[PDB]
mmCIF file of C-alpha atoms and ligand atoms in Angstrom:
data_model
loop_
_atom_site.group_PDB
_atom_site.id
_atom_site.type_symbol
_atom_site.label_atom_id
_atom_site.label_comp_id
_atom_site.label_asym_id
_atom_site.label_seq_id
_atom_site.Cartn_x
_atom_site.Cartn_y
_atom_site.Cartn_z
ATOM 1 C CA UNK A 1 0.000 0.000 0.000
ATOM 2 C CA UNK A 2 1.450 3.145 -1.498
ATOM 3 C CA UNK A 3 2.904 4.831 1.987
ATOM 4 C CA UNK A 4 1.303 8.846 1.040
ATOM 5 C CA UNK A 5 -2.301 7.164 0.960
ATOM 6 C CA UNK A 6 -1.517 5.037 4.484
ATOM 7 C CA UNK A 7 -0.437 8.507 5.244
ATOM 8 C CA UNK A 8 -4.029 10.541 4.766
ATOM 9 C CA UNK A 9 -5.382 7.068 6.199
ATOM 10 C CA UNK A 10 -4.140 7.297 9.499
ATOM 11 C CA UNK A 11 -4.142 11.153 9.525
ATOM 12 C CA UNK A 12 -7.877 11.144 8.321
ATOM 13 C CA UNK A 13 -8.322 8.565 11.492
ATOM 14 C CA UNK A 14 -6.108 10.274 14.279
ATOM 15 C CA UNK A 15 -4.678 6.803 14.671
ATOM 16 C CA UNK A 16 -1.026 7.309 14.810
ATOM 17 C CA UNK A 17 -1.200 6.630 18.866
ATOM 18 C CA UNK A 18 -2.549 3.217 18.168
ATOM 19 C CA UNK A 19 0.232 2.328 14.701
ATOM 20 C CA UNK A 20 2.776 3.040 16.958
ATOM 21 C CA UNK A 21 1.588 0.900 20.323
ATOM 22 C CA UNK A 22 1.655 -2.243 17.833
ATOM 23 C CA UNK A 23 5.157 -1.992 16.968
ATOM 24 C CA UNK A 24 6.037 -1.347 20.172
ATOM 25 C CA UNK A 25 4.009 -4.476 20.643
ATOM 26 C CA UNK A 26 6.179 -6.588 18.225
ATOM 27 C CA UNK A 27 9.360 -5.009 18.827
ATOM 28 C CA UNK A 28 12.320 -7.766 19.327
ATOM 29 C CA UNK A 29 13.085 -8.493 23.076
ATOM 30 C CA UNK A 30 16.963 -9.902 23.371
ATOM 31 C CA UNK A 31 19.356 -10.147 26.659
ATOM 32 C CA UNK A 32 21.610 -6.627 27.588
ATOM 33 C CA UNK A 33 23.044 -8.520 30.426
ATOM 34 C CA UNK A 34 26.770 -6.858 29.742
ATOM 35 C CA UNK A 35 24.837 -3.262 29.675
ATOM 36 C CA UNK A 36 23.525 -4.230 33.094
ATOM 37 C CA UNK A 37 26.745 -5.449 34.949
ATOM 38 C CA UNK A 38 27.221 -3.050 38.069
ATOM 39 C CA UNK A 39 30.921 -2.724 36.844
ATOM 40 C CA UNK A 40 29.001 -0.559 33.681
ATOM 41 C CA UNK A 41 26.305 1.660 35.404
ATOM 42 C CA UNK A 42 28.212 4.821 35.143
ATOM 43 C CA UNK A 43 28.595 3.651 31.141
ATOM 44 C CA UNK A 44 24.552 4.010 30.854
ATOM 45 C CA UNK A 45 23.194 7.690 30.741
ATOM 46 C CA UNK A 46 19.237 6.102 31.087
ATOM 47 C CA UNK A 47 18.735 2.801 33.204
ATOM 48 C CA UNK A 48 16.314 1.694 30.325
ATOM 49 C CA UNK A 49 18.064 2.536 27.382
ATOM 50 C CA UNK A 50 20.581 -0.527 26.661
ATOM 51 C CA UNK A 51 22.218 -2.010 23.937
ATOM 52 C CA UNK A 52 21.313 -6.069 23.215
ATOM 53 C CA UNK A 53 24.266 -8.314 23.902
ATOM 54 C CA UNK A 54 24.476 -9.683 20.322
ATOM 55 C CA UNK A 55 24.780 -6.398 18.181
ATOM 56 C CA UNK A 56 26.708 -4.204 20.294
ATOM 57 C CA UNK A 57 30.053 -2.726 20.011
ATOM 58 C CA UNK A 58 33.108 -3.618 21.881
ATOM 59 C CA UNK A 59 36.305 -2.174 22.606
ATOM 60 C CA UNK A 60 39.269 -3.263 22.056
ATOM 61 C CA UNK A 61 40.837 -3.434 25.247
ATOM 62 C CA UNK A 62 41.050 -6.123 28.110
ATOM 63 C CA UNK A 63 40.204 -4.117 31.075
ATOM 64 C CA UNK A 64 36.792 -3.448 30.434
ATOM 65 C CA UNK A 65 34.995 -3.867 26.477
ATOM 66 C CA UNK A 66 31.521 -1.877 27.060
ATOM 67 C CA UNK A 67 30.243 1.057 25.596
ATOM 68 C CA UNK A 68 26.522 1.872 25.117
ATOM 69 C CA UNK A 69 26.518 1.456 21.599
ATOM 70 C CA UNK A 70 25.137 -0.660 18.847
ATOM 71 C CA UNK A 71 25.535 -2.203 15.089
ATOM 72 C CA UNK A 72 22.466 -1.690 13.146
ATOM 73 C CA UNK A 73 23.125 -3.781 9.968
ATOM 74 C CA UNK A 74 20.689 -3.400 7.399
ATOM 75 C CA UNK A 75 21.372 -6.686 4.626
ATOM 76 C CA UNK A 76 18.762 -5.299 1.710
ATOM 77 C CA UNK A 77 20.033 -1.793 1.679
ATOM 78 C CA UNK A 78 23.584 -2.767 2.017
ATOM 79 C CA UNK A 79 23.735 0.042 5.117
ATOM 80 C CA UNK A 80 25.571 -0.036 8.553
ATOM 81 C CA UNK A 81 25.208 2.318 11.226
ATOM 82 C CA UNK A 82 26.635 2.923 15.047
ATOM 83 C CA UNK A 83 23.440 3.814 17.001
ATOM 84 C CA UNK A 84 25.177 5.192 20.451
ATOM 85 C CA UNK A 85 24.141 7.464 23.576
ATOM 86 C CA UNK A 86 25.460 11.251 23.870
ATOM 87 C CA UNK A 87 28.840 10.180 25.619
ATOM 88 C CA UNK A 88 29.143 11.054 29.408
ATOM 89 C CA UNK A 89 32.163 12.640 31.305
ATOM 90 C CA UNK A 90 33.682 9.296 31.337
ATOM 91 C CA UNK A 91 32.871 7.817 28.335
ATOM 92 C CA UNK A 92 34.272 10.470 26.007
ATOM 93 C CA UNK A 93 37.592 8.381 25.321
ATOM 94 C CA UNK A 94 35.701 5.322 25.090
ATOM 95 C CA UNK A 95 33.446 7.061 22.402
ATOM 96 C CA UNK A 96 36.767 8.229 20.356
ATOM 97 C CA UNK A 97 38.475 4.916 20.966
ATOM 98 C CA UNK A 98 35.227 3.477 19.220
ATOM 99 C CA UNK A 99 35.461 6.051 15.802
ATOM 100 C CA UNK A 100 38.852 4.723 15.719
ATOM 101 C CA UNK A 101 38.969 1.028 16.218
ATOM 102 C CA UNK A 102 35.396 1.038 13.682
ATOM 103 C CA UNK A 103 36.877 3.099 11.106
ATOM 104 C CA UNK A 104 33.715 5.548 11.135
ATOM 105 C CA UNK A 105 34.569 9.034 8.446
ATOM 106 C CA UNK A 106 31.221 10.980 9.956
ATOM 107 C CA UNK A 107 29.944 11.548 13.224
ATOM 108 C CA UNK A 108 26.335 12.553 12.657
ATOM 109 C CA UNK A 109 24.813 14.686 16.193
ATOM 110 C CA UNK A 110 21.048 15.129 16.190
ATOM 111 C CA UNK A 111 21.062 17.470 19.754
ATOM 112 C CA UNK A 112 22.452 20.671 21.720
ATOM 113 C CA UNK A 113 24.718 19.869 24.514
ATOM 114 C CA UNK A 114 21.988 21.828 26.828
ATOM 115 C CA UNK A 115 18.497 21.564 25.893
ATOM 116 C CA UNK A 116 15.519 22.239 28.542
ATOM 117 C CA UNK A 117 18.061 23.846 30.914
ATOM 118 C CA UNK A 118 19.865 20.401 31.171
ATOM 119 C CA UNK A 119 22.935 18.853 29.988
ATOM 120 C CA UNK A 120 22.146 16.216 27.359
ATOM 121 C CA UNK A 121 25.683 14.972 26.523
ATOM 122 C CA UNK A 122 29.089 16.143 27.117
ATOM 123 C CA UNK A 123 31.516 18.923 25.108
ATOM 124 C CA UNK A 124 33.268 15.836 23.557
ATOM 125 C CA UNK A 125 35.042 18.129 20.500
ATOM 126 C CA UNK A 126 37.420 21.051 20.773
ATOM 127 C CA UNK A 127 35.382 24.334 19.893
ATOM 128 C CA UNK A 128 38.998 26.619 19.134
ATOM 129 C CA UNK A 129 41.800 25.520 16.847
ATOM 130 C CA UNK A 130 44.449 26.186 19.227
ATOM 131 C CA UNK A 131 43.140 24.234 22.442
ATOM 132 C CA UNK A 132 42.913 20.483 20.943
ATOM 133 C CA UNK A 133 41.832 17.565 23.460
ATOM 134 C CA UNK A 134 44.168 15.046 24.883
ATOM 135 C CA UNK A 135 41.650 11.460 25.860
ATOM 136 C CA UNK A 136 44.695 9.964 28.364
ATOM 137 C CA UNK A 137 43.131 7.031 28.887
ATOM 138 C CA UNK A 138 42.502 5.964 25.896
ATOM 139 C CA UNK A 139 45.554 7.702 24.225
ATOM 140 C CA UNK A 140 43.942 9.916 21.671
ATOM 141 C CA UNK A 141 44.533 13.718 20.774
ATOM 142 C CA UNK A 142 41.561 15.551 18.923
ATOM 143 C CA UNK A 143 42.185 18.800 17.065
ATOM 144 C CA UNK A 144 39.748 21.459 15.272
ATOM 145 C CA UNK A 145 40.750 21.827 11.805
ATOM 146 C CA UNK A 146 37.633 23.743 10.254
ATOM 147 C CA UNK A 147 34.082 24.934 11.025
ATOM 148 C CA UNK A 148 31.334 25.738 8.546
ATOM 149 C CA UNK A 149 28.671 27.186 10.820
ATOM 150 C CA UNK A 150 24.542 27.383 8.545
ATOM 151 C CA UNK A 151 21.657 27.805 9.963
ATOM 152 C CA UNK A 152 20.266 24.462 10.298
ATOM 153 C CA UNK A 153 23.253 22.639 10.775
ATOM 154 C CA UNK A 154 27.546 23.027 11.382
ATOM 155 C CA UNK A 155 29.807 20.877 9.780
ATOM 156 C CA UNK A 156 33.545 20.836 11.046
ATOM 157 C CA UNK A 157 36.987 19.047 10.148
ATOM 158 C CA UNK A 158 39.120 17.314 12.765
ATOM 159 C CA UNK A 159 41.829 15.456 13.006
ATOM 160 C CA UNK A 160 41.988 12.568 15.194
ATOM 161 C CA UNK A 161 45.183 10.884 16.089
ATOM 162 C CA UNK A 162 46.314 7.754 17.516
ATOM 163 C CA UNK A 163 49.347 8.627 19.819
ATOM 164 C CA UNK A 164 50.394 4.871 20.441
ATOM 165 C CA UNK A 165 51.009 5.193 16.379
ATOM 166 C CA UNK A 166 51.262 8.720 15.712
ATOM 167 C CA UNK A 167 48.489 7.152 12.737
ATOM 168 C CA UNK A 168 45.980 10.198 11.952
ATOM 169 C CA UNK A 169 42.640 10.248 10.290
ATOM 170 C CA UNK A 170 40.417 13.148 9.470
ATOM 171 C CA UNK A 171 36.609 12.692 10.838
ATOM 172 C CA UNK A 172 33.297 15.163 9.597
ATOM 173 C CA UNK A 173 31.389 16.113 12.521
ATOM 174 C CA UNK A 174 27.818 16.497 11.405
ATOM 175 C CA UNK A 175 26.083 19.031 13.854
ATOM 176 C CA UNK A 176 21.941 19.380 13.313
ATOM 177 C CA UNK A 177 21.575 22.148 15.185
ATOM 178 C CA UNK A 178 18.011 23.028 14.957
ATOM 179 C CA UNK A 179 15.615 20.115 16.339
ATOM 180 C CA UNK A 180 12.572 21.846 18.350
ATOM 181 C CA UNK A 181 12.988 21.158 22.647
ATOM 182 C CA UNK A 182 9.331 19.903 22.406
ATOM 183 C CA UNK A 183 8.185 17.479 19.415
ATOM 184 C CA UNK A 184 9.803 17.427 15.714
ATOM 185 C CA UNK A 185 10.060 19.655 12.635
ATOM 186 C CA UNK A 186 7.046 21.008 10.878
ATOM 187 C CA UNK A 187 8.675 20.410 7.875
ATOM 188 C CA UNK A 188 11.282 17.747 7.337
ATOM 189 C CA UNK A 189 13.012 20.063 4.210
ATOM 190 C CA UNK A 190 16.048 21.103 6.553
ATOM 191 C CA UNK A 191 16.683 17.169 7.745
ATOM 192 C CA UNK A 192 16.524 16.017 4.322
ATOM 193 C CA UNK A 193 18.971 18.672 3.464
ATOM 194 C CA UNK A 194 21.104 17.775 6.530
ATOM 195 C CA UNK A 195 21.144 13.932 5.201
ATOM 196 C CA UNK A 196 22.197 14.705 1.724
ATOM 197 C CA UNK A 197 24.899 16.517 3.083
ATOM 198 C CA UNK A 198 26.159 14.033 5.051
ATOM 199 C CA UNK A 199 25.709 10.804 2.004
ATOM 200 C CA UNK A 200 27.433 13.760 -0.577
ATOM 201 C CA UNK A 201 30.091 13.437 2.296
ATOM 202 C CA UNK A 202 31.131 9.608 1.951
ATOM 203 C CA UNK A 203 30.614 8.770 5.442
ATOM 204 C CA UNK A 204 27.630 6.712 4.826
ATOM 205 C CA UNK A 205 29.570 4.557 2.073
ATOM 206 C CA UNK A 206 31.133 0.948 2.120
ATOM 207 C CA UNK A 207 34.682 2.264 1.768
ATOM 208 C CA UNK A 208 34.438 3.634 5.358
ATOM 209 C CA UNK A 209 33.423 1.465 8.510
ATOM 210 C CA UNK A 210 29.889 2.585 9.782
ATOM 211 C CA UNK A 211 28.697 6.382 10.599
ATOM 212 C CA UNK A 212 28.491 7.229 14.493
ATOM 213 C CA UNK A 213 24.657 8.344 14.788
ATOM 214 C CA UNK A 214 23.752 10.016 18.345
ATOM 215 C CA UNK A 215 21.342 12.247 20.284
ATOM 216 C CA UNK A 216 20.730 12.578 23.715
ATOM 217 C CA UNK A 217 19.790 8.334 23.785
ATOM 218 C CA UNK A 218 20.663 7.159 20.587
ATOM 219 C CA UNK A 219 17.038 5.850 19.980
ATOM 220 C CA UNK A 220 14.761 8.843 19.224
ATOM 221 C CA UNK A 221 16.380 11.476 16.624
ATOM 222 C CA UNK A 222 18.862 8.848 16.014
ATOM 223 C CA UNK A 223 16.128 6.051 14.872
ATOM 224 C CA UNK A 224 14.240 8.900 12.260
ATOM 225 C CA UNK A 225 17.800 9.605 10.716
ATOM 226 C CA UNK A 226 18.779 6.148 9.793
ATOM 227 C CA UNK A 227 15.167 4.634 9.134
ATOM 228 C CA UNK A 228 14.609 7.778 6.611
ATOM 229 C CA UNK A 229 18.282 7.012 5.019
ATOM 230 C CA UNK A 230 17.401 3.166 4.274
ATOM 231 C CA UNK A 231 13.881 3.566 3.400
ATOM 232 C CA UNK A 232 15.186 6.086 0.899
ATOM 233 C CA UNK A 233 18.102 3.598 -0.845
ATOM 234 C CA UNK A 234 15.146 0.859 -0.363
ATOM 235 C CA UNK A 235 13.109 2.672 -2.874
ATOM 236 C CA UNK A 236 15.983 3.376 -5.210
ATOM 237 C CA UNK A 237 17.332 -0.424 -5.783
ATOM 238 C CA UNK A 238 13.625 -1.979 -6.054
ATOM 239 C CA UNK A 239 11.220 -2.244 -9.183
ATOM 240 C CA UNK A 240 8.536 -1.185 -7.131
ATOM 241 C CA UNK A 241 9.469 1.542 -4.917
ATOM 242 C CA UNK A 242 5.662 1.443 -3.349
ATOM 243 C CA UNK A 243 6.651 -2.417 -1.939
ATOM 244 C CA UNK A 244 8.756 -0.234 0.870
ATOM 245 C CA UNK A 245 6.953 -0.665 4.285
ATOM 246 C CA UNK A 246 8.499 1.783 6.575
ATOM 247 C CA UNK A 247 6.736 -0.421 9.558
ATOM 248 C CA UNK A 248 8.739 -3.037 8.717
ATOM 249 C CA UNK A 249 11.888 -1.011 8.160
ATOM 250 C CA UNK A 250 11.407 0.052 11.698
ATOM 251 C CA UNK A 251 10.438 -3.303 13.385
ATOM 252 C CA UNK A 252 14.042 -5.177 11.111
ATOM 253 C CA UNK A 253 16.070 -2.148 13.125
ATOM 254 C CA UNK A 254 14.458 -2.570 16.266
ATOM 255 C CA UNK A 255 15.966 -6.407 15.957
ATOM 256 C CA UNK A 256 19.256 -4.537 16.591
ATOM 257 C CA UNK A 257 19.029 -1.641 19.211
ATOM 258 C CA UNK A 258 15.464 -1.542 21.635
ATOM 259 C CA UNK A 259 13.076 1.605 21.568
ATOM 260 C CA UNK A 260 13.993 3.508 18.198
ATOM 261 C CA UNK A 261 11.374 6.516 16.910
ATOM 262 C CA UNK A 262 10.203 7.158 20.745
ATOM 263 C CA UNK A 263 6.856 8.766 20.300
ATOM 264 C CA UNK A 264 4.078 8.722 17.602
ATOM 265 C CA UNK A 265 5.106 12.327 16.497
ATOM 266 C CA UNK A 266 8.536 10.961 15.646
ATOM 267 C CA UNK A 267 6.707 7.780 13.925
ATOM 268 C CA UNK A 268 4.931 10.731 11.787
ATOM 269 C CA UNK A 269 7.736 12.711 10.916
ATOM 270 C CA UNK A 270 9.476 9.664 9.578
ATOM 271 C CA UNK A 271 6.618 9.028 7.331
ATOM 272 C CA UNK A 272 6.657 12.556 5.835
ATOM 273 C CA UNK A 273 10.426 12.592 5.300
ATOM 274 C CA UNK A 274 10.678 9.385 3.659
ATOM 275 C CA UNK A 275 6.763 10.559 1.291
ATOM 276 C CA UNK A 276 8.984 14.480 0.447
ATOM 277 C CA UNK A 277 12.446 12.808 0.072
ATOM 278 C CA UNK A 278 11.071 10.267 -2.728
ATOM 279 C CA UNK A 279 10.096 13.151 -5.120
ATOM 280 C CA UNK A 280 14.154 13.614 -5.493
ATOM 281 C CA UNK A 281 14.841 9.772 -5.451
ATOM 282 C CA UNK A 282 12.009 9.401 -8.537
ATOM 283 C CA UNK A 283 13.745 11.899 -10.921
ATOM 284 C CA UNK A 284 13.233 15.425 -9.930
HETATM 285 O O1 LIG B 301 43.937 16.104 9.580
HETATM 286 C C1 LIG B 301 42.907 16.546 9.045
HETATM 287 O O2 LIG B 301 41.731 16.148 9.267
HETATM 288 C C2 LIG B 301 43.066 17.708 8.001
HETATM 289 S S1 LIG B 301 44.456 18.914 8.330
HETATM 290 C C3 LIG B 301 44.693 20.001 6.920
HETATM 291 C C4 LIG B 301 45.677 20.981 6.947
HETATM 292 C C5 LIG B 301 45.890 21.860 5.868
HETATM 293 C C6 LIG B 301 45.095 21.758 4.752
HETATM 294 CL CL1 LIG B 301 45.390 22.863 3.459
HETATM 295 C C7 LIG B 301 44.090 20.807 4.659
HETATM 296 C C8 LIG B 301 43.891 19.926 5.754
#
């Protein structure tokens, strides 16, 4: 069923409360037991947001291999992505150690650092050229190289380096800037533009390891930024771009990381991304 007539359907009804309690419904249910280890709780910003045991990411270190982080691999679309928290105070080096040891080219970042009067994740990146960031325990040095400031979204160059191997990589740091306190966009124009941006980029490519998608959780934002992005490529590879069921999209993902799109608003505003972005990815 053509998506843009669901659309009206449910819109016409007032039902998307009741679409989005049955996948919630369906959603996969796997183990986090690693996530909930008391060694980890200061690794968790939310108590209920945790990655499953068989798709997260692990560091490469002895001492301790958790991060709140996950690998959403999507085998149709031929897509990875890193689906992680805002890192904490003490997870900043473990975040950096994880763009590193994965390979990622983009970091995409779907919040402010204070939103509501509260801090929502840490100052993780240097803001002035001349005052780079030294990670000691994970041995990293970070450096501005570049900022491009718009109005709906920064982009800036740095240069991470590993000091064990004096080895350097430059990573995009994809900033949208813009996303309401309260709900979602009233038009999803400036997040299309912001996704475009970041595919015209390379980071979402195969010759990179997987983009680094966060907000404040890693479920909300983050789950309308990659389920847009592969429903999207979905419709470009098949003969019958209609066949694309963004339900299903949702509930394949949600086999990988628990609780993404948070709220039937978000659900909504996934729909009417994926309905405006098709009239570029069908010729225009
Ligand atoms: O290490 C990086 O990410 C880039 S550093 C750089 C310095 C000078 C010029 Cl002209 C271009 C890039």
């Amino acid at each position: 069923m053509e998506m843009e007539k669901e659309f009206e359907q449910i819109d016409k009804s007032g039902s998307w409360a009741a679409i989005y309690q049955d996948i919630r419904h369906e959603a996969s249910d796997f183990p986090s037991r690693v996530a909930k280890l008391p060694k980890n709780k200061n690794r968790n910003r939310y108590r209920d947001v945790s990655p499953f045991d068989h798709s997260r990411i692990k560091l490469h270190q002895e001492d301790n291999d958790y991060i709140n982080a996950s690998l959403i691999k999507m085998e149709e679309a031929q897509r990875s992505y890193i689906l992680t928290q805002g890192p904490l105070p003490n997870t900043v080096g473990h975040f950096w150690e994880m763009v590193w040891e994965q390979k990622s080219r983009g970091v995409v970042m779907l919040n402010r650092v204070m939103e509501k009067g509260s801090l929502k994740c840490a100052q993780y990146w240097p803001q002035k050229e001349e005052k780079e960031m030294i990670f000691e325990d994970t041995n990293l040095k970070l450096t501005l190289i570049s900022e491009d400031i718009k109005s709906y979204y920064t982009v800036r160059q740095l240069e991470l380096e590993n000091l064990t191997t004096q080895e350097t990589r430059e990573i995009l740091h994809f900033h949208y800037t813009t996303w309401p306190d309260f709900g979602v966009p009233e038009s999803p124009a400036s997040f299309l533009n912001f996704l475009f941006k970041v595919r015209e980029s390379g980071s979402l490519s195969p010759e990179h390891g997987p983009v680094v998608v966060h907000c404040s959780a890693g479920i909300g934002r983050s789950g309308t930024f990659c389920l847009a992005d592969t429903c999207l490529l979905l419709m470009d590879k098949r003969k019958d771009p209609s066949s694309v069921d963004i339900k299903k999209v949702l509930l394949e993902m949600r086999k990988f990381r628990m609780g993404l799109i948070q709220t039937a608003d978000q659900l909504r505003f996934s729909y009417l991304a994926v309905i405006e972005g098709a009239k570029f990815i069908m010729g225009d």
